């Protein structure tokens, strides 16, 4: 459960904003 529906609001972080959601995130 805190890991089969904590997937989603997770996984859209990284679809591509600014491709400056990896300098931070990592």
Do not use: C, E, F, M
Request: proline share 4%.
């Amino acid at each position: 459960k805190a890991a089969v529906s904590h997937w989603q609001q997770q996984s859209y972080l990284d679809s591509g904003i600014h491709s400056g959601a990896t300098t931070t995130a990592p």
